[PDB]
Design a protein around this ligand. Structure first.
Ligand SMILES: [Cl-]
Length: 169
């Protein structure tokens, strides 16, 4: 019948926590093999909003729209890593492929949530051009740290924001 927004957000948050745990684990595996000297970023990754606090029903559609777009970008980046990241990342498979599959399951769940709740859905933003290959083997590893770290942070803020928003429903 009519969906219970609170229960739908609870379910979505549970699946997001799962993906967050898979991402944290792969990031630790990557750092064990290729230690990193400080935080790493990529220009082609979305900007983290870290939007928590003053989160009410009014913000829910926007939070979900933004998370969908961010996760799609992260998916493209994971796919690129597996494709052109370089031989150095071969042992991160099959874990990176499994992460990609679970990221797809979360995207489907978000689309289902927005449809069931009759929430306005975004206009198709033009797909970004292809990602260039890494400039070097070390550049590919830095990119992997940036992609996994950024995905971790995106999912952490999604959990936090969606649970704070749920408290006002
Ligand atoms: Cl799903």
């Amino acid at each position: 019948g009519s969906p219970d927004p609170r229960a739908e957000l609870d379910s979505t948050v549970l699946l997001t926590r799962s993906l967050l745990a898979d991402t944290r684990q792969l990031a630790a595996q990557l750092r064990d093999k290729f230690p990193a000297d400080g935080d790493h970023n990529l220009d082609s990754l979305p900007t983290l909003a870290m939007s928590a606090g003053a989160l009410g029903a009014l913000q829910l559609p926007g939070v979900l729209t933004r998370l969908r777009a961010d996760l799609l970008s992260y998916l493209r980046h994971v796919q690129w890593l597996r494709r052109a990241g370089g031989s150095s990342l071969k042992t991160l498979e099959p874990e990176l492929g499994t992460l990609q599959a679970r990221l797809d399951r979360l995207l489907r769940r978000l689309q289902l949530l927005m449809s069931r709740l009759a929430l306005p859905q975004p206009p198709p933003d033009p797909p970004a051009p292809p990602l260039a290959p890494p400039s070097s083997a070390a550049g590919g590893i830095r990119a992997a740290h940036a992609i996994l770290g950024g995905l971790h942070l995106t999912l952490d803020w999604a959990v936090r924001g969606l649970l704070l928003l749920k408290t006002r429903l």
